[PDB]
Amino acid sequence: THLRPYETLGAHADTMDGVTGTRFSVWAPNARRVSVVGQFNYWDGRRHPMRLRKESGIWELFIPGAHNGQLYKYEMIDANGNLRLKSDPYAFEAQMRPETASLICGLPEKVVQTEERKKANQFDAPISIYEVHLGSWRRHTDNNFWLSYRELADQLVPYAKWMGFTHLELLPINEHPFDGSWGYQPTGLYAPTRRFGTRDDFRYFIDAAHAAGLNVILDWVPGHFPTDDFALAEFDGTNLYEHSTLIYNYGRREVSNFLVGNALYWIERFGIDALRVDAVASMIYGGRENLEAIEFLRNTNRILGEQVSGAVTMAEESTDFPGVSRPQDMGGLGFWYKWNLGWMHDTLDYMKLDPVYRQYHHDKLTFGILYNYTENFVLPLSHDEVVHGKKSILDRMPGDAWQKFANLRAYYGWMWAFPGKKLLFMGNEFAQGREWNHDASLDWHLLEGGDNWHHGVQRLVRDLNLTYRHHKAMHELDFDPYGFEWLVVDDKERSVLIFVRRDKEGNEIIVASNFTPVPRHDYRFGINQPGKWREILNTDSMHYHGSNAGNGGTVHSDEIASHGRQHSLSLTLPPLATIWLVREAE
Ligand SMILES: OC[C@H]1O[C@@H](O)[C@H](O)[C@@H](O)[C@@H]1O
């Protein structure tokens, strides 16, 4: 009604007086007269004229014979007296490249969210996200054509599922005219792009993802106004959706309706489990504060939480605007999760340095625990990091080849144990050497031939995901100080960092990282829980083409004081590696 305007505006199928047809509604308070033109009219605007309404400003009409499948637009007389063809803002399907225009299809049946999908979005869940641009994941060999939604449901769902990810994150699949925007310069907010098939196909892709046990996070764009093809600027002749560089007018009721309404659309009518909002800073800009942007995010989040609890939202915000992932009543904004850009910048800068200069930059691996409780973090290695001459993640690493791969493997070992949910952009899991190209398939060829270093990283990421999801200690208490404790925080001259993760029932898994090529034998450190400890993950294993250094079985604790603790372990730490230890019941 007042929240889901997509249910009454646009083109919908109805039958009045007995006979069937479709009814068209468009919001335009100004503008002299408005008509519907399509395949049922010879595109003649003199035929079917619409009637405007007073206390809404909506032109409407019920055209008999006009059915699902035909194309249509609106021929209007702009409030300044101009003749302009407009596509429906609430178009559910469209046609890209060789034109622009709306379709008649109506709304899809609608999806009631199951309980396993709500459980998976929670703060106590393991959450590991595979971020993908549908247009450049893979391509057909012969001709370089895109995979359709249905082919992605048969190839991209099983892959993300086998690799052990819990979530799939899509770069924007709303209709957009150019591939170079990656989806962030949209023209139709309610239509899945037609690049990969119909909107029912997309719906089928989401069903398949649910059926495989994945949740789906969709990149959502309320921060970028349609500045293309004349799709939403000067709509009726006045600044309908825009202000008075082209930004939204979040102040108006109906505009806020068009945006909020779009959010319930994806979650209820496509079964989307979460929404991510980018450039939140670009939206809410202390002194520039756009009061109406801050309030729009707060109302969206509040309404979502009330109308579809179980679904959550995530945000990227680059100015440390306090309280991004906190309840509205204080700081506010009201997002469930926040991208940890600081950690991504810190660990990468650290990771980049010659292993030999790391002793002077230790503070880049520790500093992130100081503020881990001010926001609910996702640790993101996303698309922004591998474009525009920023190099891939693997090209950031130092040394000859084997060293770059050992470094990258150790980093993932660190990343997957650090408080925060995980996000990995496609191509990173097999260590692509080249930067991402939206125009081409990923470098899947690196994985051709006999077992190689890239298979090694790919196997690691899978074990990393599987292990991480098995042990509560690794995910239960990310956002509670009890969940993480330092064991060795100040071994700067050797670059060794050891800490513990802790589940609700007190169980500890020990994480040790060696960030230099020098292997450490008989490395002694204090523990809280004496007994028998055993490796469960070792990034230097030869299964990932490491050198296979390690502890080769159970190691018992010694009652020998160390680092202020009554008991200790003496271990091998493999070079440029991280390991995880679990305690054996006795
Ligand atoms: O089109 C398919 C092929 O395209 C190339 O650009 C990629 O590097 C290959 O890995 C891929 O398999």
Side-chain angles (χ1 to χ4, degrees), residues 552-579:
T554 323
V555 185
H556 196 284
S557 50
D558 313 305
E559 188 179 14
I560 291 163
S562 188
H563 302 256
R565 290 177 167 86
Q566 189 158 114
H567 289 86
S568 56
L569 282 162
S570 196
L571 298 180
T572 284
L573 309 180
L576 299 168
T578 103
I579 89 270

Short mmCIF file of all heavy atoms in Angstrom, two decimals, residues 552-579:
data_model
loop_
_atom_site.label_atom_id
_atom_site.label_comp_id
_atom_site.label_asym_id
_atom_site.label_seq_id
_atom_site.Cartn_x
_atom_site.Cartn_y
_atom_site.Cartn_z
N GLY A 552 53.56 -32.76 13.37
CA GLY A 552 53.38 -34.20 13.16
C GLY A 552 52.73 -34.96 14.30
O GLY A 552 53.25 -35.97 14.76
N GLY A 553 51.58 -34.48 14.76
CA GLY A 553 50.82 -35.20 15.76
C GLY A 553 50.55 -34.39 17.01
O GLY A 553 50.92 -33.22 17.10
N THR A 554 49.91 -35.02 17.98
CA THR A 554 49.68 -34.42 19.29
C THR A 554 50.93 -33.79 19.90
O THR A 554 52.03 -34.34 19.81
CB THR A 554 49.17 -35.48 20.29
OG1 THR A 554 48.29 -36.39 19.62
CG2 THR A 554 48.42 -34.82 21.42
N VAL A 555 50.74 -32.63 20.52
CA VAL A 555 51.75 -32.02 21.36
C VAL A 555 51.12 -31.75 22.73
O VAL A 555 50.10 -31.08 22.82
CB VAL A 555 52.25 -30.71 20.76
CG1 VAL A 555 53.39 -30.13 21.60
CG2 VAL A 555 52.70 -30.92 19.31
N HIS A 556 51.71 -32.29 23.79
CA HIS A 556 51.19 -32.05 25.15
C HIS A 556 51.79 -30.78 25.73
O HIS A 556 52.91 -30.40 25.42
CB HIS A 556 51.45 -33.25 26.06
CG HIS A 556 50.63 -33.24 27.32
ND1 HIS A 556 50.91 -32.41 28.39
CD2 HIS A 556 49.55 -33.97 27.69
CE1 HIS A 556 50.03 -32.63 29.36
NE2 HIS A 556 49.20 -33.57 28.96
N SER A 557 51.02 -30.10 26.58
CA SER A 557 51.51 -28.91 27.27
C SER A 557 52.56 -29.25 28.33
O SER A 557 52.58 -30.36 28.85
CB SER A 557 50.34 -28.18 27.92
OG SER A 557 49.56 -29.09 28.68
N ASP A 558 53.44 -28.30 28.64
CA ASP A 558 54.39 -28.44 29.75
C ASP A 558 54.04 -27.43 30.84
O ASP A 558 53.74 -26.27 30.55
CB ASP A 558 55.83 -28.17 29.31
CG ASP A 558 56.21 -28.89 28.03
OD1 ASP A 558 56.06 -30.13 27.98
OD2 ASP A 558 56.67 -28.20 27.09
N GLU A 559 54.07 -27.88 32.09
CA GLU A 559 53.89 -26.98 33.22
C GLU A 559 55.14 -26.12 33.42
O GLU A 559 55.87 -26.25 34.40
CB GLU A 559 53.54 -27.76 34.49
CG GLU A 559 53.15 -26.87 35.66
CD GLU A 559 52.80 -27.67 36.90
OE1 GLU A 559 53.10 -28.88 36.95
OE2 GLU A 559 52.21 -27.07 37.83
N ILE A 560 55.39 -25.24 32.45
CA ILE A 560 56.51 -24.32 32.48
C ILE A 560 55.96 -22.94 32.16
O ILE A 560 55.41 -22.71 31.09
CB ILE A 560 57.57 -24.68 31.42
CG1 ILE A 560 58.27 -26.00 31.77
CG2 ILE A 560 58.57 -23.54 31.23
CD1 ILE A 560 59.01 -26.61 30.57
N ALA A 561 56.11 -22.03 33.12
CA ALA A 561 55.62 -20.66 32.97
C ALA A 561 56.11 -20.01 31.67
O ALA A 561 57.24 -20.25 31.24
CB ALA A 561 56.04 -19.82 34.19
N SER A 562 55.26 -19.21 31.04
CA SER A 562 55.66 -18.45 29.86
C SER A 562 54.67 -17.34 29.56
O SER A 562 53.46 -17.57 29.56
CB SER A 562 55.79 -19.37 28.64
OG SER A 562 56.36 -18.69 27.53
N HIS A 563 55.17 -16.13 29.32
CA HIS A 563 54.30 -15.01 28.99
C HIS A 563 53.24 -14.80 30.06
O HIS A 563 52.09 -14.49 29.75
CB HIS A 563 53.60 -15.26 27.65
CG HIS A 563 54.54 -15.47 26.50
ND1 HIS A 563 54.79 -14.49 25.56
CD2 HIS A 563 55.30 -16.53 26.15
CE1 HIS A 563 55.65 -14.95 24.67
NE2 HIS A 563 55.98 -16.19 25.01
N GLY A 564 53.61 -14.98 31.32
CA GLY A 564 52.70 -14.74 32.44
C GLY A 564 51.68 -15.83 32.68
O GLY A 564 50.73 -15.65 33.44
N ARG A 565 51.87 -16.98 32.04
CA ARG A 565 50.93 -18.07 32.20
C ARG A 565 51.64 -19.28 32.80
O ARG A 565 52.83 -19.49 32.60
CB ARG A 565 50.23 -18.41 30.87
CG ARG A 565 49.23 -17.32 30.41
CD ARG A 565 48.60 -17.63 29.05
NE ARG A 565 47.45 -16.78 28.74
CZ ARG A 565 47.52 -15.58 28.16
NH1 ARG A 565 48.70 -15.07 27.84
NH2 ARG A 565 46.42 -14.88 27.92
N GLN A 566 50.87 -20.06 33.56
CA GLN A 566 51.37 -21.21 34.31
C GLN A 566 51.73 -22.39 33.40
O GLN A 566 52.66 -23.14 33.71
CB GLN A 566 50.34 -21.61 35.36
CG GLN A 566 50.79 -22.64 36.35
CD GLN A 566 49.98 -22.62 37.63
OE1 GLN A 566 49.25 -23.56 37.94
NE2 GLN A 566 50.09 -21.52 38.39
N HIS A 567 51.01 -22.56 32.29
CA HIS A 567 51.30 -23.63 31.33
C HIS A 567 51.68 -23.14 29.91
O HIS A 567 51.30 -22.03 29.50
CB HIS A 567 50.14 -24.60 31.24
CG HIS A 567 49.98 -25.45 32.46
ND1 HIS A 567 49.27 -25.04 33.57
CD2 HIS A 567 50.44 -26.69 32.75
CE1 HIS A 567 49.30 -25.99 34.48
NE2 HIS A 567 50.01 -27.00 34.01
N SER A 568 52.40 -23.97 29.16
CA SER A 568 52.87 -23.58 27.83
C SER A 568 52.96 -24.73 26.84
O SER A 568 52.99 -25.90 27.24
CB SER A 568 54.25 -22.93 27.95
OG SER A 568 55.15 -23.80 28.61
N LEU A 569 53.00 -24.39 25.56
CA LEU A 569 53.31 -25.34 24.50
C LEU A 569 54.62 -24.91 23.87
O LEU A 569 54.92 -23.71 23.80
CB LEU A 569 52.24 -25.34 23.41
CG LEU A 569 50.90 -26.05 23.59
CD1 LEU A 569 49.92 -25.51 22.57
CD2 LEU A 569 51.04 -27.55 23.44
N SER A 570 55.40 -25.89 23.42
CA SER A 570 56.59 -25.66 22.60
C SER A 570 56.37 -26.23 21.19
O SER A 570 56.30 -27.43 21.02
CB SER A 570 57.82 -26.30 23.26
OG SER A 570 59.03 -25.80 22.71
N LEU A 571 56.25 -25.38 20.18
CA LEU A 571 55.83 -25.84 18.85
C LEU A 571 56.79 -25.49 17.72
O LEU A 571 57.60 -24.57 17.84
CB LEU A 571 54.48 -25.23 18.49
CG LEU A 571 53.21 -25.50 19.29
CD1 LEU A 571 52.06 -24.73 18.66
CD2 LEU A 571 52.91 -27.00 19.37
N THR A 572 56.68 -26.22 16.60
CA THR A 572 57.22 -25.75 15.33
C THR A 572 56.25 -24.77 14.69
O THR A 572 55.06 -25.05 14.55
CB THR A 572 57.41 -26.88 14.31
OG1 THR A 572 58.57 -27.66 14.63
CG2 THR A 572 57.61 -26.30 12.92
N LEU A 573 56.74 -23.60 14.30
CA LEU A 573 55.96 -22.73 13.42
C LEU A 573 56.58 -22.74 12.03
O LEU A 573 57.66 -22.19 11.83
CB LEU A 573 55.88 -21.31 13.97
CG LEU A 573 55.45 -21.14 15.42
CD1 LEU A 573 55.43 -19.68 15.75
CD2 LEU A 573 54.10 -21.77 15.69
N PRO A 574 55.90 -23.36 11.06
CA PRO A 574 56.33 -23.37 9.65
C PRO A 574 56.53 -21.94 9.11
O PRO A 574 55.84 -21.02 9.56
CB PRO A 574 55.16 -24.04 8.92
CG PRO A 574 54.31 -24.67 9.98
CD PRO A 574 54.55 -23.92 11.25
N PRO A 575 57.46 -21.75 8.17
CA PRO A 575 57.73 -20.45 7.53
C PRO A 575 56.53 -19.90 6.79
O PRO A 575 55.79 -20.66 6.17
CB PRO A 575 58.82 -20.79 6.51
CG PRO A 575 58.61 -22.25 6.21
CD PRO A 575 58.30 -22.81 7.58
N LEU A 576 56.37 -18.58 6.83
CA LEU A 576 55.28 -17.91 6.12
C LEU A 576 54.05 -18.81 6.12
O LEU A 576 53.56 -19.22 5.07
CB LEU A 576 55.69 -17.57 4.68
CG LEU A 576 56.88 -16.62 4.43
CD1 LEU A 576 57.33 -16.64 2.96
CD2 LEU A 576 56.56 -15.19 4.88
N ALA A 577 53.57 -19.12 7.33
CA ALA A 577 52.40 -19.97 7.50
C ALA A 577 51.58 -19.57 8.71
O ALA A 577 52.07 -18.90 9.62
CB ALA A 577 52.84 -21.42 7.63
N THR A 578 50.32 -19.99 8.74
CA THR A 578 49.56 -19.96 9.98
C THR A 578 48.91 -21.30 10.24
O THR A 578 48.51 -22.00 9.31
CB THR A 578 48.49 -18.85 10.05
OG1 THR A 578 47.19 -19.41 9.83
CG2 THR A 578 48.77 -17.73 9.08
N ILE A 579 48.85 -21.68 11.52
CA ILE A 579 48.24 -22.95 11.90
C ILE A 579 47.18 -22.76 12.98
O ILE A 579 47.18 -21.77 13.71
CB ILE A 579 49.30 -24.03 12.29
CG1 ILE A 579 49.67 -23.99 13.79
CG2 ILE A 579 50.52 -23.92 11.39
CD1 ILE A 579 50.82 -23.08 14.15
#
